[PDB]
Every structure is written in C-alpha cells, then in structure tokens.
C-alpha cells in the first residue's frame, strides 16, 4: 500500500482530495474523499471557482444515462446528469472500474474557492445515494468489478498568502500499519448509510458532561471526512463550550472566536495549548457493555490560520461547531487518526496517528476498555416521514 501513502492532498479547512480520472482518454480531476455521502459527482461546466470540469462528450467510453439527479446537502446543493463512465485511482489500486458518475451542471455554495477540487467521491452507502438507493456508489462497483477487498482506511494529517497545504493517505482496500501506533479499536457501524456511530460518553478533561447519552447521538452520530469541524448537536455543543471556557478562562475571546468566526491569536510560538483542555467521546465497542474512548487535543480542534496582516503571530479557529442534524466527526476528530472503514465487518477502527499534531505533555489517544453495567441505549430513532415511508425498495 506504499503507492497509496500521501495520495490525498488539500488546503486546510477546505477537504481533503484524491486524484482520479475519468473517460477515455482519461481526464484528470481532483475529487473530495468523502465518508458522508454516497454520489460519485464532478464538475461538468463552467464555474468560477473551477479550474477544469469533466467533458462528457470527449470521452469514447462514456454512456449517458438519460436521468438528472439532485442533492441538497444541509450546506450547499448541486444537480447534474447521470452516466457512467471508466474511473481509475493514479495513486489508488492498479484497477479501471466503469462507475456511476454525476456530471454535475449547476450548483451553489457547494465549490470551494482556492480549494482545488472539482468534485467529489462519497464512500458512504447505497441507502442515502441519489436519486435513491438504485444508483450504485463508487466503492461498491469497485469491489463488484475487481478483487479490492471491501474496506478503506484514511490518515487524514493536519497542518501568509494562503491556507496551509495539508496531506494524508486513503489505503483502498487495507490497512497500512505504518500509518499508526498501538492499538486498534472498532466501533459498531449502527446502520449502514452514514457511517452512524454510538457515543456513550464525552468527557472534557476528564469532566463527565453528564447528558443522558441520547443526546449525543441526537439526531445520529456519523464519521464524515468531507466535513470540516467537529460538529455537536445544539444542547451538546452548548454543554461543551461552557467547559472548555471555564478550562480557559485565563483568555478572555470574543463571541466570534466561540462561534468559529474569528481568529484568536499569540505570539509565534507562545500559544498557552496547556490552558485547553482534552476532549474525549467514548464510542460503543464490539462486545456489549464496553465502549474505547478517542481523545483529540486543543491542536486538532483549534485549526491554525496565518494572518496576512499578523503573520507574526500565530492564529487559530475554533473548529467545533453547533449542529441541527447531530454529531458530525469531521476532519478535526480524524486528523487524530488512522480511521478504519472496515464494510466487512460492518465496524470502524481508530487507532493514534503516526501524523497526528500534538506536543511534550499530551497526545491524541485511543484507549480500552471501559465497562458499564446495565448500559442503557444512547441511539435516537429518527422520525419516519410519510415520504420516506411511501418508498418502495426492490
Ligand atoms: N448534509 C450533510 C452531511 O454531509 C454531507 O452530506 C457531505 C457533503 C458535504 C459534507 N459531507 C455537505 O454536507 N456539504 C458539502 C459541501 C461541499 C463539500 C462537501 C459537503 C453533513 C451533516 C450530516 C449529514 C451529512
Ligand atoms: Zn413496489
């Protein structure tokens, strides 16, 4: 798996992207790697903030599946036509597969100015793929059509004039012991259509924040590399930054840092990192009744910015944020770890980084057991809509 090592590229904050081709001759695109969806879509025309876009019409292997497709993310939407079409990996398997993709023709605040991608790949499951479920996802036609065998695994690696340049791996197809240190805990998959997890547990340095559990997975609790922050349900969120204010409340910030709209700043080299405290999610594991915890530190969740203008300073983004739709591990939480897609075996592993950020005191961690007795359901149970209901599934 040495040829897929450092195959993902990105500016910080603006997702992570791996090369790919598509057509014949094969037209290269740099496509967001993305566990929270399941539609293999490129930009297909023009757009300001596109450098190139796919061209149909000049590839010989293309066949156009005569249907349009529409999705609408909680952020950002796009519509486009369906097709199919050869794709290959450059620095993935040595495999061509022919794919579904959506040649995507409009679309709003969805394209990332700078980004330097021009599509996108989601690696979640049929359930939630667009149209419906009959749209086969990419990951899916590969394993079909050649030997890969049925997992992923990502290292996603953090970091004047612009972002900063990030790196990480996508191993399609195993696992690179390389790319992390000691042990490797798995997670149930709940159901598969996100990567929907169960938290049982947050701690703030080493401060339970005593909600029922439910509330953490309220409305669901998914692994999404395509978002950038980690994103916590309203009371959640709430609970959290009131704690991780009291650890540092030797700083007195703005709202707007709190909100993660502004940058807080300290001298090159000064930045007080033991003031802001460890957060942990303890996840359900494998046997019943115990769980591992995941513990990130202040240097994933507070993103570094360089200031055109106090570019003698270093400066940082509070990257946690409120969510309506429930917990979202974005980039933030993975880029503590080497994360496990393992479909098989219908789980997801984490184990520490070999390229996680941290310093001389503390590390990012994954560690246990841990052992309830009588541990109570933490999943919610979403309300079922006459619409979704009425979906036939053959
Ligand atoms: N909606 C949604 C969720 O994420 C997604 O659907 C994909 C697409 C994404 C990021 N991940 C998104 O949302 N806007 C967007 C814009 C550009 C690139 C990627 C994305 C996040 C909330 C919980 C459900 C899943
Ligand atoms: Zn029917």
Redesign the pocket.
């Known amino acids: 798996f040495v040829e897929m090592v450092d195959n993902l590229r990105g500016k910080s904050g603006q997702?992570y992207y791996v090369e790919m081709t598509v057509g014949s001759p094969p037209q290269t695109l740099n496509i967001?790697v993305?566990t929270?969806?399941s539609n293999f879509a490129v930009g297909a025309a023009p757009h300001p903030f596109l450098h190139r876009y796919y061209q149909r019409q000049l590839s010989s292997t293309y066949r156009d599946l005569r249907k349009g497709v529409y999705v609408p993310?909680?952020?950002?939407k796009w519509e486009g036509e369906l097709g199919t079409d050869l794709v290959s990996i450059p620095h993935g398997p040595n495999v061509t597969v022919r794919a579904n993709i959506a040649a995507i023709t409009e679309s709003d605040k969805?394209f990332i100015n700078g980004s330097n991608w021009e599509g996108?790949l989601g690696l979640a499951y049929a359930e939630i793929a667009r149209p419906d479920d009959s749209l086969e996802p990419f990951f899916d036609s590969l394993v079909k059509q050649t030997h890969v065998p049925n997992l992923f695994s990502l290292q996603l690696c953090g970091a004047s004039e612009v972002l900063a340049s990030v790196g990480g791996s996508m191993i399609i197809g195993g696992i690179d012991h390389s790319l992390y240190t000691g042990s490797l805990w798995y997670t149930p998959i709940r159901r598969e259509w996100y990567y929907e997890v169960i938290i049982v547990r947050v701690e703030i340095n080493g401060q339970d924040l005593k909600m029922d559990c439910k509330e953490y997975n309220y409305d669901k609790s998914?692994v999404?590399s395509?978002?950038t922050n980690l994103r916590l349900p309203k009371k959640v969120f709430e609970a959290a930054v009131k704690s991780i204010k009291a650890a540092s409340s030797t700083e007195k910030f703005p709202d707007g840092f709190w909100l993660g709209e502004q940058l807080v700043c300290w001298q090159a080299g000064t930045t007080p990192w033991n003031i802001f405290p460890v957060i942990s999610l303890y996840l359900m594991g494998e046997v019943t009744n115990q769980s591992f915890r995941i513990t990130i530190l202040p240097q994933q969740y507070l993103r570094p910015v360089e200031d055109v203008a106090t570019s003698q300073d270093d400066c940082y983004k509070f990257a946690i944020s409120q969510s309506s739709?429930?917990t979202?591990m974005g980039a933030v939480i993975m880029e503590g770890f080497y994360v496990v897609f393992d479909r098989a075996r219908k789980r997801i592993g984490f184990a520490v980084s070999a390229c996680h950020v941290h310093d001389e005191f503390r590390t990012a961690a994954v560690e246990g057991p841990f052992v309830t007795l009588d541990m109570e359901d933490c999943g919610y149970n979403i309300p079922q809509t006459d619409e979704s209901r009425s979906h036939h599934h053959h």
């Open positions: 997702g967001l993305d929270g969806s993310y909680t952020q950002g969805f996108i998914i999404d395509g978002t739709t429930g979202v």
